[PDB]
Every structure is written in C-alpha cells, then in structure tokens.
C-alpha cells in the first residue's frame, strides 16, 4: 500500500500526531491533528477499497477463465485419457486371465464374441500366425483366458473346412491365415 500517493500523507500525519501527543501540546493541536489523520484515513480507505475492488474483479475474471479452460480441456481430452486410465488400472490389477487376453489381443489373437463363463458354450477366436498358434494351441487343447478349451472346428479366410492335422509348419504357406477357431470350454 506504500505505492499509493496517499500513503506518504497518511504516514506523515500519523507521525506528526504521535510526536505532538508525545510532546504534550495543547488541546487545539490535538483537535487539528485528529482532523488531519481522520481525513487522511478517509482518503486511505477510499483508495484501498477502490484497489481491492479492482483486484477482486481481476481475480474473479482469472478464476472464471481458468474454470472455462479446464472445462474445455477436459471435454477435449476425454477418450484418450479415459482409455489410458483404463489400461493403467488393468495392468495394475495383474490377473492371469486378464494379462493373457491382453497379450493375445496385442500379438493378434483377438476373439469374435464374448468369452462365455458357462461350462458349455462356443468360443470363436482368430489366429494370424503359426507362432501364436503353437504358443496357444496344443493339439485339441486351447489355452485361452488362463483356461482350457476343447478345440472343435477351424475355418480359414475363404470359409473352407480344414482339419487339425493339416495345420503344420510345412503346410502353413498353403493355409489361408488368419484362421478362425471355434472351441468348447472343458
């Protein structure tokens, strides 16, 4: 508040009043110094209220524009942020089936429908490469979602019947990968 022009006048009036009361002057001196300090304080509170209202208006404008900016920033970046949070919490959960299906969707082994929880149901999933096949499939046993499934049937890309015996490293180029395999839960 020292930057205001009235601050110097108010300080001078206060110092003069203190020096006059400390020296023991007459009562008329007390009255005139009282009047001086009173008008100085009136002007000081005037200027202080003006400056405080100015700063309050500025603060309200700044907080309002900050609110609007945060609102629009949250409205803009919702999809990517929410998906990143989802995958972060998924990795934090650390389950066998969860991590297994995440890796299987990463390398390319994505299903066609919901993995059923019933003891008997059809589960269909694609396999792009023979590497993921031999990693997940073993004869008639399928390791999916940390569970064992009984392999039922296999289809190629052109909807032609293929047996499990024909699926081999020698016959992989002759196969139309990816292969859609449907199986039953054991």
């Amino acid at each position: 508040f020292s930057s205001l022009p009235s601050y110097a006048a108010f300080a001078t009036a206060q110092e003069a009043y203190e020096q006059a009361v400390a020296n023991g002057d007459s009562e008329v001196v007390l009255k005139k110094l009282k009047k001086s300090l009173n008008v100085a304080k009136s002007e000081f509170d005037r200027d202080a209220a003006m400056q405080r209202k100015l700063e309050k208006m500025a603060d309200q404008a700044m907080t309002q524009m900050y609110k609007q900016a945060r609102s629009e920033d949250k409205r803009a970046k919702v999809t990517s942020a929410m998906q990143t949070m989802l995958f972060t919490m998924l990795r934090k959960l650390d389950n066998d089936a969860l991590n297994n299906i995440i890796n299987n969707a990463r390398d390319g082994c994505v299903p066609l429908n919901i993995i059923p929880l019933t003891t008997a149901a059809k589960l269909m999933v694609v396999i792009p490469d023979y590497n993921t096949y031999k990693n997940t499939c073993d004869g008639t046993t399928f390791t999916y979602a940390s569970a064992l499934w009984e392999i039922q049937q296999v289809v190629d890309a052109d909807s032609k019947i293929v047996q499990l015996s024909e699926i081999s490293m020698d016959n992989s180029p002759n196969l139309a990968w990816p292969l859609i395999v449907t199986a039953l839960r054991a």
């Binding site: 900050y66 609102s71 949250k74």
Partner: protein, 853 residues
C-alpha cells in the same frame, strides 16, 4: 376356539376373536316368520367374519384360517402354500387369481343378504346384521336382537356389514360376473358400444341390486355431491363399479368444434373411474380466434396428439396403450458413471478400501438398457382398484385433518407465486419450444389468473413425461420421474402454495417438512417426538411400492384434506372441479413414454406440486388406520383401564353406529394419539414413539397392525426385515432419511447428531455424474458440502468411520494446493487465498451443528 365376532353392547364393543328359554322362543318365532325366504338357513365351519378377519388382519405366522378357507372351497391346493412368498403381492402375483376364486362366493352371498333384508322388510323387523352370523355360503341363521314392529315398515341396519365387506369385494373381484351377458361365468362377455361413455343407469342398477338398503344417497356423478364426505362416499362405490365397465370408455371426452372455419378436436369432459362423467361448462363452439391461454389448454390436451397419432399395441406392458406419436420407437439408456481417479488414489494411499475393512464402496451409478425405462412403467400393474372401509375412512380423514389445523391455506394470485427454478422442463409438448421460464415470462399475471379461473370450472387433461434419473443408488433398479406439464404446475401452485409454505414454515409439528437437521434441528425434532411418553419405544417402517401401488381413494382423500383450507375463497363447484383437475392431471393421466401414449391405472406422480405433502398425509392416514384397527381388534373385556374401554366403545359408535361428525370424540382421539403415539413424518419416512405397555396390550398400533393395514389397503406386503424397533432412546432412531442418530457431548450438553453412511459419501466423492465434476476444480465446494454432511462421523466409536472426515479434509487441502499451483503456472497467485483456509479447518464444520444459529 377363537372365532371372529362383531359384538356391540353397553359393556363391550368391537370386532375381534372370541372364545365360543324366552330367548329361544323369540328365536323360533323370528325363524317361523322368515321361513319362506330362501336366504334363511346346514352351516359351514367358517363364517364371513372369519374370512374378513383373515383378509384384513393378516399375519405371516398365523394363516391357518385363511389356508383352510382357500383349500375348502377349491380356491387352491395345499402344495400352493409351499411356494415361497405365496402371500406377497409383489412376488408371485398369481395369488390375485386365487382370491378371485372367492369373488363369486362373495358376490353370490351379497344377493342373499339383500333377500334377507327383503324378508325383514316383508315382516317389519328392525335389526342389525353382522358378519359372524352369515356363513360363507350365504345363508343367514341369526334370529336374535330382532324387535317386532308393524309389518312392512321395518328398516335394517346394514352399515357395519357392508362397510367391513367393502375391501373383500375389490380384493376378490366379486363383480367380475357382472361383465358377462345374463350374469354367468360360462356365458361370454358383454359387448358394449365404443361410443357409449355414460354408464349412470348401470351404476344405479348395480347399486340397487347389491347395496339396495344402504340408506345414504349415492351419486354416480360426483358433480352432484353435498360435500367432501359425500364425494368420498360416491368415489368408494364408483371405484368398485368401474371394474365392470370397459377401460376404453374412460378418459377424456372429445368433440369436434370449429375454429375460424377449420374443424378442431378438443376435450369437452372426462370420465373418471371415481368421479364419473364431468362435462365442461365453458365450451364455446364456432370460435374465430385462439389466444395464448386456449393455445396452452389445447396443446396440453392429449386429444389432438391421440387423434393425429397412429394406433399402438404394446405387448411388453399390461397397461392400456393409446397411440404412437412417432413412427420409430425410442429407447432411452442410462450412461455409465464417471470415476474420479485422483480421490480414489488419495484414499487408497491413506489405507482405505483394504480387505476386511468395515468401510467399502456400496453405492455406484447403475446403467440400464433400452427396454428398462418402459419396464419401470411395467411396475404400475401393482396398482389395483381397492375399496376402503367408508366409515373408517371418513373418520380417519377427519382425524388426519386435525393434524393440519395449525396451518393456514387458501388461494393466492399470480403475483404471489414463487418458483424455485425456472430453467426446467415444462413437460410435453411444452418441452419442444422452451423451458418453464419461457411460459412464465410470456404469460402475464392476468393470463395466469384467467387460466386458474378456467380450471376452476373445467378440467384439462394433460400429458406427463416420465424420464430416467441419473443419480447414485445401491440397487440395480432404475428410478423414473414424471415431469408434469406447466399447465398443471401453474394451477397446482396457485391452489396449494399457501398451505405448502405454511407447513414448511411450522416447527414442532408432526409433519417435519421444512425443518433443517443442522444447527441443532435434529435434536429439536428428537425432543419433540419424545413429548411426554410413559414407556417410550421407537419404531420405523417403509412403504414397498408406495408411489406405484397406493390406491386412488387415498390420493383423493389427501387432495380433499389439502383443499379443505379453501372455506372462504373457493366455492363447492370450484373445489370439486379443482379435485377433478388434480385427478385428471396426476391420478388418472396420460403417460408419454418412448414417444407412445399410455393410460396410467393410478398411483401418485412424482412431479406434482403436492408430492411430499400428499405422501405425508397418506402416511398419517395409514398410521391412524393402523391405530384404529389395533384398538378395535382387542377383546375389550381384559382391559383394566375404563377410559380406553369407553373410548373404544365411542369409537365403534362413531364408526358403525353414527354418521355425523362428533368433534368431541375427534379431539379425544387426537389427544390420545399425541399422548401414546408421537409421530415424526417426512413424506414416506416415519418414526413413531409409542407407549410400550399400550402396544403390548394392543391399545395402540404395532408392526403387525401396520402390516395388516398395508395388506388390505395398500395391497402390498410389508416385511418385518425392513422395519426397525428401538427400546433405548439414548441410541436414537435406527435410520431416518438415510441418516443414523448418535448421542454425543457438545459443550457439556448431550445432543443427538445425524451421521450418514460413509459408503454413500465415499461413492458420491469417487463417482460423479458428469465429466467436468471429475477434475474441473469445481469439486472443492462439492467436497466441502460432503464434509459438512459427514462431519458427525468423527465422533463414532469406529475409527474407520471417523477417518473419512479427515481424509476429505486432506483431499480438499490437496485440491487447493493443486489449484494454487495451476494458477501460479498460468499467471499469478490470487490475493484472497487465505480465505480458503477455513475450508480445511474442523471449526467451520463443527459450527454447522451448534444450536446457536
């Protein structure tokens, strides 16, 4: 053994279970005088009084009488009782058919009774008929208390009999046989003309055939009634008589008019199932101009929408379908709830949500599919046409009106109307053009007064839109709200706002609407309920499917109680037409769900102006009904206090032996209830402090009595698992408005504080209903309010409950720190930062409960 008996003499009077030469000569003489009448009596093991007692005083523990009655008359088999929840109406509705097997057996009896009366009318024998004296077949073997008079001038006393039988008629659907040609279950149904809506002659015929000797005048149309006591009496019979008539005849009465040369279709009446035919008095044909008021009246009227829309046949629900206003059906789904990761991580870092902890998340945002909204409407089948005991109802309405004698009511002008929020939906079809502010600013005060005067003489059918609510809940079931049109609100407010504000501004009464729980208010209400009780015991219950399964008679009664304050401003016809408007716009309305119109069978809409207050009046009425049923179910000869015995005698007198209102006994009963049955009612929540000894001896209402009343009135089954009973006042009520009570020490004073469930507060903090509320820096006030609400948790003996408040405080402080950091990063720090300090100090939240302010 114990048999039902409706006894009345100078010593004992009441309907309860009892043990069981010149008089015999008089009996034989009366029998010889009435030998030719076929209705005069073999005898069955159970009489009519036994069935009425079993159906009105139903207890899950003792059902031997009802089971034997159902098995003897081939109503159902014994293995049917092995099915779980066979007595419930919500669970396993097939029992509704079982009771129907008795309907005919009841109906066939009624005629016999009339014949019996005729016999007395042919012999000049004045006497009283009782239920315990007529077997379930229909024969009358009673020949006592019959004095001889001039033959041909005898009058029967048929008040108590038909009064107590009223509920069994609607519960068993005894009049179904009236819907067949020549009255025969084997013959086909009656094919009524679709263009016929006036069944007045049919109602008169049914009344003269069933209730012939009912000396009170019955008006098929409620327009010609003397007072509310007559409107209720007429509606009690209209509810029963409307079951026979087809449902297509009811609804608005439409007609073609001419406006400036073009033919318009406007509603010129309404066919209420309880009020009959109501024709508008200000119908002007061949008009040449249409103003704003008439524009709103015709837009809110569903006649044009139903005429323009195409026919609809909905098989998903059982309610009647009107039309489909759109070519494509709309399916509304609920969005998944948001998740605030910051607060969740902050709570987990402090040791919350650990395994085995008593504090866990129980409340989340539950999502729904497309066919869920309408499925909520599919619950409206829980509302059945119910006939109530008319004399008991006319007594309970007065006893309840005595609770509202301290308030004032009347009609206010448009300048005196106060609206809380104007930027809200105005209903259908008013939501297509703007909000409520649009119509509140377009229409001047004179236009609103003109609309009110028009509604005072005519009835306007309206359309109410039911939508899903996005809110936190602990059950997978969804919640729907029925926003009514603005034409209904601007009238209901103008009519009831004075009383609504008088009730909300009154402290220390039974209805605690408007009383805050902060600043020592909860302690004030708790000490008000404890107003001088000898052996105080607290009790609380709930109403399963209250807004859905509540009959229309109780809603009409509540509306009449609310409108009785207009003794000098409104006339008779004005009040009747206001009641008709309330019934057409709330009771029996037109529901626009998924762009399709349906007929609501009944129940209370949740978008009305008189919503909470109607439920409060309903709760008071149910409580008084339970009290009267408990006091009259006692033997009366085992009570050692003469005062209550004489009071029960006078109660029976004013119920079944008197017709005019006895204000003295009403005052006595009100004082007795306030002394031995203190009540705190907020809408559907109720906490009662009753004298334990009087409840033990059956002098006041108890849990089983409320259960029985809800069974034979609200047609719902109240399980004792949801009702709580407290024997120690120091601990306080178990749960009131989802708030528990705890006695703490504040300033050397022992005061009751209300604390909520920590799971609800934590769910509100973690899961929000919008994306901006997650991390928008506006959550500071949200968490401040949550801490204000959950502060009383810090005094709980469970430290896990107390740590929630400290966690909220630390989270608010961390949010303030992040906000200050962000402001410093973008520009500069704020000057009034210190003002935020009070938001992370416990004094600001402790002062909110001090009774100083």
């Amino acid at each position: 053994v114990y048999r039902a008996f409706d006894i009345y003499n100078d010593k004992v009077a009441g309907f309860a279970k009892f043990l069981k030469f010149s008089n015999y000569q008089h009996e034989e003489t009366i029998y010889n005088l009435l030998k030719d009448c076929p209705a005069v009596a073999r005898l069955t093991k159970y009489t009519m009084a036994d069935l009425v007692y079993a159906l009105r005083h139903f207890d899950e523990g003792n059902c031997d009488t009802l089971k034997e009655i159902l098995v003897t008359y081939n109503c159902c088999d014994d293995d049917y009782f092995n099915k779980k929840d066979w007595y419930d109406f919500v669970e396993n509705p097939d029992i509704l058919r079982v009771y129907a097997n008795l309907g005919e057996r009841v109906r066939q009896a009624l005629l016999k009774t009339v014949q019996f009366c005729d016999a007395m009318r042919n012999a000049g024998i004045v006497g009283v008929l009782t239920l315990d004296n007529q077997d379930l077949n229909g024969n009358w073997y009673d020949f006592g208390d019959f004095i001889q008079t001039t033959p041909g001038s005898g009058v029967p006393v048929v008040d108590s009999y038909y009064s107590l039988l009223m509920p069994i008629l609607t519960l068993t659907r005894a009049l179904t046989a009236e819907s067949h040609v020549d009255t025969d279950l084997t013959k086909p149904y009656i094919k009524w003309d679709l263009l016929k809506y006036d069944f007045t002659e049919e109602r008169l015929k049914l009344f003269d055939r069933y209730f012939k000797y009912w000396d009170q005048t019955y008006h098929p149309n409620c327009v010609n009634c003397l007072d509310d006591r007559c409107i209720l009496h007429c509606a009690n019979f209209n509810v029963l008589f409307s079951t026979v008539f087809p449902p297509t005849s009811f609804g608005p009465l439409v007609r073609k008019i001419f406006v400036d040369g073009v033919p318009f279709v406007v509603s010129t009446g309404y066919h209420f199932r309880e009020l009959g035919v109501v024709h508008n008095q200000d119908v002007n044909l061949h008009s040449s101009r249409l103003s704003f008021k008439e524009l709103l009246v015709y837009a809110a009227d569903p006649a044009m929408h139903a005429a323009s829309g195409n026919l609809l046949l909905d098989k998903r629900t059982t309610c009647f379908s009107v039309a489909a206003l759109t070519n494509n059906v709309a399916f509304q789904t609920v969005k998944p709830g948001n998740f605030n990761k910051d607060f969740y991580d902050f709570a987990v870092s402090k040791g919350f949500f650990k395994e085995g902890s008593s504090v866990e998340l129980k409340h989340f945002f539950f999502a729904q599919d497309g066919n869920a909204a309408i499925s909520d409407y599919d619950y409206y089948r829980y509302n059945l046409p119910t006939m109530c005991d008319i004399r008991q109802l006319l007594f309970v309405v007065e006893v309840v009106d005595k609770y509202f004698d301290c308030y004032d009511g009347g009609c206010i002008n448009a300048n005196q109307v106060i609206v809380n929020n104007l930027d809200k939906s105005a209903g259908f079809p008013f939501n297509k053009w703007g909000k409520a502010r649009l119509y509140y600013d377009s229409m001047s005060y004179e236009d609103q007064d003109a609309l009110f005067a028009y509604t005072k003489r005519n009835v306007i059918p309206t359309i109410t839109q039911m939508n899903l609510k996005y809110a936190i809940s602990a059950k997978n079931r969804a919640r729907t709200v029925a926003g009514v049109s603005i034409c209904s609100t601007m009238t209901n407010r103008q009519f009831h706002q004075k009383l609504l504000k008088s009730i909300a501004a009154t402290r220390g009464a039974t209805v605690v609407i408007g009383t805050s729980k902060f600043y020592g208010g909860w302690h004030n209400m708790l000490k008000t309920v404890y107003s001088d009780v000898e052996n105080p015991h607290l009790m609380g219950w709930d109403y399963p499917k209250c807004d859905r399964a509540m009959p229309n008679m109780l809603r009409i009664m509540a509306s009449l109680v609310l409108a009785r304050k207009h003794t000098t401003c409104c006339s008779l016809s004005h009040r009747f037409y206001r009641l008709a408007n309330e019934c057409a716009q709330v009771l029996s309305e037109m529901v626009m769900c998924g762009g399709s119109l349906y007929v609501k069978p009944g129940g209370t809409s949740s978008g009305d102006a008189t919503t909470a207050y109607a439920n409060s009046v309903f709760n008071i009425c149910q409580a008084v009904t339970a009290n009267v049923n408990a006091l009259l179910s006692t033997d009366g000869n085992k009570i050692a206090d003469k005062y209550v015995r004489n009071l029960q005698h006078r109660l029976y007198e004013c119920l079944y032996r008197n017709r005019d209102v006895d204000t003295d006994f009403v005052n006595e009963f009100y004082a007795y209830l306030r002394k031995h049955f203190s009540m705190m009612i907020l809408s559907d929540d109720a906490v009662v402090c009753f004298n334990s000894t009087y409840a033990s001896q059956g002098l006041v209402a108890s849990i089983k009595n409320f259960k029985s009343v809800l069974y034979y009135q609200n047609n719902v089954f109240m399980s004792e698992a949801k009702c709580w009973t407290e024997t120690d006042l120091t601990k306080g009520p178990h749960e009131f408005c989802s708030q528990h009570t705890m006695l703490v020490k504040q300033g050397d004073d022992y005061v009751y504080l209300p604390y909520p469930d920590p799971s609800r507060i934590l769910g509100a903090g973690c899961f929000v209903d919008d994306i901006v509320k997650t991390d928008g820096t506006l959550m500071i006030e949200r968490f401040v309010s949550l801490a204000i609400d959950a502060y009383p948790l810090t005094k709980h003996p469970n430290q896990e409950y107390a740590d929630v408040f400290h966690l909220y405080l630390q989270y608010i402080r961390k949010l303030h720190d992040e906000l200050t950091g962000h402001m410093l990063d973008m520009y500069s720090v704020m000057l009034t930062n210190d003002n935020t300090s009070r938001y992370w100090e416990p004094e600001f939240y402790e002062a909110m409960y001090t009774p100083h302010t």
